[PDB]
Amino acid sequence: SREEVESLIQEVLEVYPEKARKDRNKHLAVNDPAVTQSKKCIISNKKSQPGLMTIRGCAYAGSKGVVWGPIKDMIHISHGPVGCGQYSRAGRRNYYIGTTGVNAFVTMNFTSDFQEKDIVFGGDKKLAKLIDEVETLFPLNKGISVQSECPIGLIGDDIESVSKVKGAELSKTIVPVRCEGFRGVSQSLGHHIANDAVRDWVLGKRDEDTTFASTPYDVAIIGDYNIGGDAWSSRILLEEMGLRCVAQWSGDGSISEIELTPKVKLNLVHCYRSMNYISRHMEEKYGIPWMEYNFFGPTKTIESLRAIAAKFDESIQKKCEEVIAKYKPEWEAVVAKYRPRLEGKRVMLYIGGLRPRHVIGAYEDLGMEVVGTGYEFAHNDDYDRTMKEMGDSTLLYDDVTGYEFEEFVKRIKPDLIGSGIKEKFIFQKMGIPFREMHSWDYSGPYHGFDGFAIFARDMDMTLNNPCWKKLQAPWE
Amino acid sequence: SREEVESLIQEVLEVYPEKARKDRNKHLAVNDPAVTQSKKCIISNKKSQPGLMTIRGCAYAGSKGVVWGPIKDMIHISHGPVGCGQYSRAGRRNYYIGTTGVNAFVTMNFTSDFQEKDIVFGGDKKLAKLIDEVETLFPLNKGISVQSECPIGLIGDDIESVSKVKGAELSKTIVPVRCEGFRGVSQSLGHHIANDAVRDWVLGKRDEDTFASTPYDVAIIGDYNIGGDAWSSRILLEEMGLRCVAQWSGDGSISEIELTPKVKLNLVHCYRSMNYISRHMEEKYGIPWMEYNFFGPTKTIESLRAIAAKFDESIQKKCEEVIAKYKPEWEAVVAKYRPRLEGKRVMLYIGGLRPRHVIGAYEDLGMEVVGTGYEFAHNDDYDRTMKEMGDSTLLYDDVTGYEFEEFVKRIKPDLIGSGIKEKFIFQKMGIPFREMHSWDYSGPYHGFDGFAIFARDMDMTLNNPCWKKLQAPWEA
Amino acid sequence: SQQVDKIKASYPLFLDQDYKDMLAKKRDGFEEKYPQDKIDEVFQWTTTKEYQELNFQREALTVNPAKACQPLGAVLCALGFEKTMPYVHGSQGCVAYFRSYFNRHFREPVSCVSDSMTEDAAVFGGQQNMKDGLQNCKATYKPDMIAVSTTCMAEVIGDDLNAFINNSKKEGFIPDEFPVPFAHTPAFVGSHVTGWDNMFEGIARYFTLKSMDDKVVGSNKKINIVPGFETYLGNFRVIKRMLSEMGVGYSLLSDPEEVLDTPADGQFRMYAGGTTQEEMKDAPNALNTVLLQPWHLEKTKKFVEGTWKHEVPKLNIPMGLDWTDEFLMKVSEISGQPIPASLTKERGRLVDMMTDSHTWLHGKRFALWGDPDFVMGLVKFLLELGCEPVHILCHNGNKRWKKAVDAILAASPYGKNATVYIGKDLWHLRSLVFTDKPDFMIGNSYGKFIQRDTLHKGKEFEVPLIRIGFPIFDRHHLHRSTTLGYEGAMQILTTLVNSILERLDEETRGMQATDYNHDLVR
Amino acid sequence: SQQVDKIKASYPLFLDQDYKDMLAKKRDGFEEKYPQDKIDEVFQWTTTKEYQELNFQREALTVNPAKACQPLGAVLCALGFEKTMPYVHGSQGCVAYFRSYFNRHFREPVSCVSDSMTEDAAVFGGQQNMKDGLQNCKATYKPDMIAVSTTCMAEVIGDDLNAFINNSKKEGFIPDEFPVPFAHTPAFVGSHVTGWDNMFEGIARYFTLKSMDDKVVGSNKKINIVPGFETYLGNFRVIKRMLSEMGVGYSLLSDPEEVLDTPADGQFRMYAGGTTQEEMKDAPNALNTVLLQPWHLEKTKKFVEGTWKHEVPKLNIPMGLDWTDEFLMKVSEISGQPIPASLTKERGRLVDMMTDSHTWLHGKRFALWGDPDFVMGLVKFLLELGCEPVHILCHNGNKRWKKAVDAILAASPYGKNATVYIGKDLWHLRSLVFTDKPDFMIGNSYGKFIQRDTLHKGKEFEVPLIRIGFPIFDRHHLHRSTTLGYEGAMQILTTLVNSILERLDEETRGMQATDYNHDLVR
Ligand code: ICS
Ligand code: ICS
Ligand SMILES: [Fe+3]
Ligand SMILES: [Fe+3]
C-alpha cells in the first residue's frame, strides 16, 4: 500500500499520450493525514480530456435533471432538440406526491422538439406559442421553467425576453435557465446556473409578504432530492425532534415551498455541492444561517440531529434525545444482523458531488472499509472534506476515466463497488459485487434510521449473493 | 348426392377387418325422407368395437361429470383411484353461483385415492373415515354423493351400507352411485344410473312436505348451464310469467331438486340424460313433462309458445310480449351474420342431444348441416334426428376416428362442430372448427342472448384470415 | 339483452341488472343458501392455523390432488416412438380422459386407443377384446407398433397381458413379428410418472432382453438419454441441441417432440418423428444411459444396469446452473467430447442474467409443487437465485426423495425456512399459503383457485400464480417453453423476475397513493 | 420505523401512518396544493373528447415524445462493427445519456466516447478536440476503428468532420491507414433511426467508394443484410439462423449481437464479434443487399444502388406470416437456394398456433407505437391474427410511410376502424385511449404511465400495457426476445393471447361475483 498505490497510478498512466498523461496525473492522488488543504494534493473541476470516456454529464443534467426537474407543481420545458428531455425522462428517482399530468409533472417530458427551421429562424416564437399551449392543456401548473439545451445559446435566442413578456401577459412565474450543455465542464455548473435562476426569478416573490405564521423552529431541507424517499425519511426525524420543515429543495418540492424558505430560521444543507450557492445568498440577503449535515448511517445521523438541536433551545434538545433513544434499538438490530456479514470488506466508490464522502460513515457502521473514492464533478472544497473522512493511504480519483477505474479495480480487487449505471455491468462481469449509488439500484431510501435498514439490507444481499461464486465454469 | 354417400360409406369400411366392417356398417346410414322408425335405418347404443378409437367416455363421466357434479352445494366423492377425478376436474363448464370451498364445491376434486391396500382390503372403512373428514373441513356442505369408479364394484365394496350407516349417524344425505366406468357402453348408462340415485336417495325427501306453490311453477330438467345456458333460458321463462323452482343440475342446489316434485310442469331440454327421472315424476307425482329447444330464435320462439299453451291466457300474453321484446335483437344478429354464413355446410358430432338440437340455429343463419351423429344416443334420439336432418344427410353413430376423418376429407364441410379430441385434427386439415361441448370457452348459446354469441362465434372462426394461410406460397 | 355491435359473453353478460335480479331471486327462493355472514365466517375459519391442523390430520380424504394415474404416463411414453399407437387394455372412459387431458395442454391431437372392456369382460377377461383390438387397431390406423398399458379395471380382474398378446399372435390376429410391447400400469399404485417408467421398461425389454448375446457396451459410441414424463417441447429440443453442439452421439429414447407439434399445412399427421424401433434394439451398445428424471425412472434404471450392463451415472435433473454443469461434465467424460465454447458462453450468459436480476429475486418466498424431479430442480435453481422455497409440495414424492431435497435445502442459507411435504395435496397447500404466506406460487393451472381464495381474504393476502409445470390449461402455448439446461434456466429466471416486477407495478399504480414508486426503470 | 426481519423499502414504508400523517402535514402547510375536488375535475376533463381536440391542435408543444435524437442510432450502428469505438464529436453530456439509455435497456456495458467540446470550441471549433480525442481514444481503448458522429452542438457551429479527421491524420495524431468513418448526425433532423442510416452509409462508402474498380456484382455469391436500428438480440439471431438453415451465404452488415450479450465469466470484454472491415470492403461483390428496415434506410439504399450497383429488392420488414414468406421467397430467388423443410415446418407451426388462439384474439382492439418499420410489421401481423389495430402512432413517421400503412389497413376488414398518426406523441395517444378505448396497448415502457392514467379514471377503463418495442426499462431481459420471422411472430402471438387471458382471469377472480367465468381451461 501507499508506495504500491503511487506505483499503480504511474503504471496506469503509461498508456496515455503525453498530454493526457500529464493532466490525468493531476487528478489522481493518495490521501495523507499530515496534509489538510486539498489544493496542495489534487486538482478538480477541470475540463475532461477528449476521448477518454469520462463518466460526467452536462450542465443541462445539472439544472434540469437535478435541481429544477424535481419541483413537482411546475412544468419544465426542455428547450431544444428531442434528445436531452427523452434520455432524462424519469431516469432519476426524485420522488414526489402528486397527480401526474394534472397538478404534478415530474415524470413527464415537455419539449419544444427543435427542427432545423427553429435553428435558422430561432425558437423564441415557438417558445411563446409553446407556453400558451401549456396553459391550455395543463391549467393547474403553478409555474414554468425553460431548460436551455445546447443549440439555444449558440443560435442567439433570448429566452429571458420571452420569459418576461409571457410572464406578465399571463401573470405567471416563467423561469429562463441558460444551462446549455456546452457550458462549464460537467453537471456542476448546471447546479450554479440553476441556483441563480431560483434566486433571480422565484425566491424574491414573497419578500414583502407578511401573511406567513412563523415559529422559532422553522427550517428547510436544502439539497436533498428525495431519491427513493431519502428526504421523507429525513423530514420524519426532524419533526419528531420538534422542528417544522417549511420547505424541501427540491425533492418532492413545490414552488410555494421555495417561496417560503426565506421565512425560516435555519437552512439544513445536505448536498453542499449543488446548493451551497443559494444557501450563501440566503444568508447574505435574509440573514438565515446554514449548516451542513449528514444522514447516512446512525453515527452521522445521531451527530447531525445533536448539532441541529444545539442551534435551538433545551426543549428541542430534549426531543433530540427522545428520537435518538426511540430509534436506538432499531438500528442496533440492523447492525447486529448485518455487520457480521459485511465486516472487513473493502469498498470502492465513484459518484457525483457529495455521496463519495457522505456515505463513508454508513459503510463503517457496518464494519466495512472504503479503500477508494472519487467524484465526477466535485470542487476542491469537497476534496477538503473528503480527506477528513477517508482513511490513510486511500486512493483518490477525480473525473476518473473508464480505463483508469477498470485498471484501479483490477489491482485493488475490492469486495464491493458503489457507482453509477454506466459502471455497473462492467464490474459485474468481472465478478465484483456492485451497488448503484445514484439510483440506489431502485431501492432505498438510504437516509436516516429507516434508510440505514434498507442500505444494510442492500449491501448484504449483493455482496453475499450466491451468483458471485459461479463466474468460473468448473471445466475452465 | 345420396348415391355418392352410400358409396363413400362402403369405401371407408373397406379398411376394417371383417367383424368391425359388418358391425360399423350398422351404425352408418344416409337419412331418407320416408322413415319414422329409425331401427329400420341405423343401430345405436351398442358396445364399441375394440381398438377403433371411439370418442365415447364411460358411465362415471355420465354420472359424476354430467349429472351429479354440477350440483353445487353438495360434495361429490370420486371413489377409487386418483385418475377419474383429476381428468374431470373443472373440464366441463357447468356454471354456478357460489363461494367455492365454503358452500359450493363444483370445481374441486374430492377423492379417496385408492392405493393397492384398499384394493385388497376394500375401501368401505376408508369411505366412512373420509365422510367424517369431509364433515370436519367442509361443514356447510348440504349432502354428499359417492361416485363409484371402476374398482369399487369389482372388489365387492358395499357403498350403500356405508351411505345408510353414516347418513343416519350424521343425519346427512349421502347418495351412493354405482356408476363404475365398466358398466354399460358409454356415458349414457351413467345418466340412467344417476337418475335412479336421485330418485332413490334425494327426490323422496319432501314427499310428505307441504312450500307455497303457484300455478306457474316449473322446473328446467336436463340443462347443465354450460357457459350460462340455463341462466339465459331461465330469464325468458320468468319474463314469460313462470317461476322456475329448480334447475337440474346446472347451478342446481339439492334443495331445488327436493322441491321439484311440487311444480306443475317439467321442461326437458336434454331428453337423453333426464327422460328417466321425468317419466318417474309423472308416474308418482302426476307432473307432466315436455321437450323444448332453445337453440336459435326459431326454436326458442316455438318452444316459448308451446310452453305457454300449457297455462292460461295471461302466460300466453306475456309470451308474445317476450317474443316482441327480443325480436329486434335477434333480427339484428341475423341481419349482420346470416350474409356471412349463408350456404356454408356444417358437420356435427357430439354427445346425446346437440347433434340434432342445434340444427335449427345453424339454419337460422342460412347454414346447412350435411352430417351429424352421436357418441351414445339411443334409437329414440335418432327418431327425432331424422325429422330435423335434411334429405340424404350422412348419419354416424359412435363414429370412429378413422371414419370421421375419411368422411370429412370427401364431404369437405366449411365448418365442423365437435369435441376437444377432434378440434386440432381438423384445424390442421384447414377446416374451421367450433367446440360444441364446451362452446370453445364461449357461450351461452341458449336463448336469444345465446344466439348472438353463437352467431358471433361461428362467424369469427369460419371467416377467420388464418384459414387462407395453411399453404406456403412456394409449396403449391 | 344484447347489443348487436358489442356482444357480451357469459362475462360480463350476467352482470346485467336483470340477470343479477334473476339470480338473487333463484337463491332466495329455492336454494336455501346459508346466510352470507355465515359463509364469510366459515371462509375466514378456513384460513386459520386451527383449520390447518385439522386439515393436515386428514388420512382418508384427498382434496385437489396434484397427480394423475399411471396409464396417463404410459400413453405419453408410447407417443415418443415412431409410428406407435398407445393402446390401453381396459375400459374406454380412461382413454377419452387421457386424450382430453393431453389435448388441452398441448393444444394438439393425441392418438390413443382402447379395447373397450365392459361388464362382460369382468367375468371372462379381456382376451377377446385384445385379439380384436390389436387386429382392428393395426388395420385401421396402420401403426408400426402398439404399446399396451392397462386401465385399473383390467388390473383388478387380473388380465395376463403377456399371455393375451401371445394368444393374439398365435391365433393370427396380428403378424408374429409385429411389435407389441406391454406394461402393467395399475392406477392404484404410484402416479402418472410410474406409468411412464413401467411403459418404457416394457418397451426396452421387448427389443433387447432376448438379444443381449451380440451386444457390446460402447460399441456404437452413443449415449442413451431417457427423458421421462416430459410435457415441455423445449425440454426435448434443448437436450438434443446441447448434445449436437458438443458433437455427442446420442439416442433420445422416447421422443414425442415431433408428434406433439405437427404443422398446420392442410393435412393431419397421426404419427411424426419419434424414437425408432432400431434405436431401442441397438441401445445396449451405447456407452451408457443417462436418466434425465431418475426419481421416477427406478424400474428403468434396474433394467439398463441389470441387462444392458450400463453404469448409469448419478446425475440430478439438468435444471439450473450447478446441475446443468454436472450434466455436461458427465457427458463430456463418458463421450470424451469437450464442452464447446458455445455452451460455456451460454452458461456465462445465464450467470450474467443472474447478476443483473439478483436484487429483485433475493429473499422472495415461493410455494411450489409438481413432480419430484421437476420440483427438486426448481428448488435447486431458486436457491441459486437467492430465493427461498418456503413450501415445497410433491404429492407423489417419497421419503427417499424428500430426504435428498432436505439435504439440498440444508446446504444453503436460503433453505432455512423451507419445508418439504410429500403425500399432501393442494388443499393442504392452500392452508400453508394462508398461515405462512409466500410471495408467489409456482405451479400448474390448479393453483389459480388458490390465488382466487387468497384474494378473497384480501388483496394484501393474494398470492399470485406463476404457471410452470403440468397441466397448464388456461394459457396458450406455454408447452413450447423450456425448463432444462441454461436455456430453461434463463426462461425461468426471466419469468420469475418479471412476475415480481409486474406485481410491484400493480401495487404502485395508484395515482397519488402508491405511484411514487411506479418507476420507469427497474 | 423498521422491523429488522421484515424491512420495508419506499413501498410500502411510506404508507405507515406516521409517514402518511407527515406527508399530509407537509401538503396542508406549505404546498398550497389545489383542492382535491379541483384535481379530480381537471383529470376528468383531460379524458374528454373536448380535451382531445385542444390536444391535437398543438403545434409548438411536444409532450412525452416517442423518439430520440440521431446520434443515439449512430452509436448503436457503430457498436455492430468489430473492435469499433463509437465516437461522438461534440459535448460529453449526450454520450453519458446514450450510454445510460442503452445500459438500461440491454442491462449491459455500452462503450462510447466524446471529445468534450465546451465553450471554447463553441467559438473556434472542435478541431483540437478531434485531434487529441482520436489519439487519446486509439491509445487508451485500442479499437481497430473509430466511427464518428456529431452532437447537435457540433452541427450548429459547423465542424467539418471530413476536414478535421484528415487534419488529424496529416498532423500525426492517428495513423494514416487507421479507419475513421464519419457521418453528420444532427439531432434537429429526423430521429434516432436517421442517425443509424447516416452512420451506416458513412461506414459503407469509407470502405468501398474508392475501390469499386475491381468489384463484380455477385462474385462472392453472398447476400448482404442491413438490419437497421435493432434493439432485440433475437432479431439479429433469427435472421442469421434462417439464412444458415437455407444454406445462404450472407454478410450481416452491422452486428452488435455479441458485444451486447457478453458472458459474465470474470472478465470484461469491451469489444466482441461484429462485422469485420473485410466484410464491408467485400460487400459490393455480393449478389444483392437486403434492407431489413427500409423506411429508415433511405440514404443507405441510395448508396448501395448508386455505387455498389445492387438492385435492392422491395421487401417489407420480415414481420408476421406474409412478409416473412415474401422475405424467404426473395432470398431463395436471389441466392438460388430452396426454402428448406425446416422453415416450412416452422411456418406451419406458426399457422397452427394462429388457429389454436384465434378465438381469443379475434376483434381485440390495440393501440401501438414505435419506429416506422416495426410499427407497420406489428400492424400487418395483428391484421393476420384477426385483431384491430385501432390507434397506430409513429412519432417519427412520414406521409409516404403513412400512405403505405393505410393501404395495408384498407386491404383487410380488420383495419376498418384504424387510424394512423404521424408526428403525434404519447400525450396525443393518451387522449385516444380515453375517447376511443382499446383493449390493450403495445408499446415501450413509457406506456406504463398511460395505463396508470386510465386506471385512475376507473378499473373498467384501464388499458393494460404489453411491452414490445424500445426502450423497455421496467422488465428484465426482454431484449433477448424476437419479433422478426416466424419465431418472432410465434413469440408475439403467445404474448398477446396470454395478456388477454391474464386480464380475463383478473376480471373473473372475484369470489361469488365474477368467478363463474374463472375457467380452468381456456
Ligand atoms: S445533487 Fe448531485 S451524481 Fe448532490 S448531480 Fe448527481 S441526488 Fe449524485 S453524488 Mo447522481 S452532488 Fe445528488 C447527485 Fe450528488 S444526480 Fe444525485 S446521485 S447528492
Ligand atoms: S347432458 Fe350430455 S357429450 Fe345432454 S353427456 Fe355430454 S352438457 Fe354433450 S351433446 Mo359433452 S347429452 Fe349435455 C352433453 Fe349432450 S357433457 Fe354435454 S356437450 S346436452
Ligand atoms: Fe396446436
Ligand atoms: Fe447483462
Ligand code: NA
Ligand atoms: Na441532447
Ligand code: NA
Ligand atoms: Na380412472
